[PDB]
Amino acid sequence: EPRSPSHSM
Amino acid sequence: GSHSMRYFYTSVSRPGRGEPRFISVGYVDDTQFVRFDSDAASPREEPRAPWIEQEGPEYWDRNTQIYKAQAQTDRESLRNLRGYYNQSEAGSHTLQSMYGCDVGPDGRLLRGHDQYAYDGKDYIALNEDLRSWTAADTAAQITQRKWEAAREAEQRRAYLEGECVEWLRRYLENGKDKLERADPPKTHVTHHPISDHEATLRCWALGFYPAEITLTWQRDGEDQTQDTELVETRPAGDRTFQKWAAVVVPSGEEQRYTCHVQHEGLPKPLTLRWE
Amino acid sequence: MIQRTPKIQVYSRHPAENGKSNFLNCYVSGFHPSDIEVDLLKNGERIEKVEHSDLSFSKDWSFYLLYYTEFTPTEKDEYACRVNHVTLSQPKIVKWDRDM
Known about the structure:
By secondary structure, chain A is largely without helices or strands. Chain A is about 0% helix and about 0% strand. Chain A: It comes from Homo sapiens.
């Protein structure tokens, strides 16, 4: 399963 | 066996034509098992291998919401990166993401990966310690400071040591023989006269899994490295791979040449000849 | 900005046998950026029913795609792959050879 998104660059 | 799981994201900006296109694919070893495309009629994670289809609707719903959120995050990252590099707001740019885990036969984490490229150049990567970053340049140091302050490495480490390892183990249990047992190549040698004096011997490996293979031509049991034409390993389209190696030989000397095949699926290395 | 010229291989899924259903493959790899046009041609004409793999990439970030169609090879029918990319000053046309 994919990683939850976190902060933008 | 040792195994890997990887997610590959590609975001491509298209200023004036709407939000960037986001595409994700997931692999276990050399087997693609999921995809997501932001430009699909109704974007959602979709199965691409039979053994993942048994995952329940909560799996597909959670993952779909994750990709939708990541597409919006990559859109923000693309806007920030063109700012960091002082680039035109008119141009199309690429953000690629690659992450996942390598595990041993006991299913323990050997290595975590979490890294990015901007317009095909390495930008930032989570180090093997899963605690620190390597930034390519002063733009990537802006991202590094932002991610250090937000404790991003902790959130990435938790995934790579937890969900990544645990879900890879589950896929391997469900995949069973498709993922655990190598599929040896079907092999044969073909002969193609060029003239009365030269012929091509071509050694074929077809339908093998995984993609790693070695094909060599030998003359009297000595490797013909400098004289072998070797094509890049290529997908058959049915999840298996193909490769061939060719050597040009004097007509009537074919019997001195043997093709040697090394693949994890073979009981032992194969020696083939024109026959 | 990084631009990488595509590698192209054109080949069948199974060894070709005239009159037997097969798949015609055009594998494009090692390219950047991802924007690319790939057509399969039968006797010089665009084949309409062509599918492709989901966009993925290699550890050096270069993209790869498989374009494919179901086909029944014959003696006379000529097949090719035509590729357009920013790195190519003209379309690259690779003919299918059943022996490669």
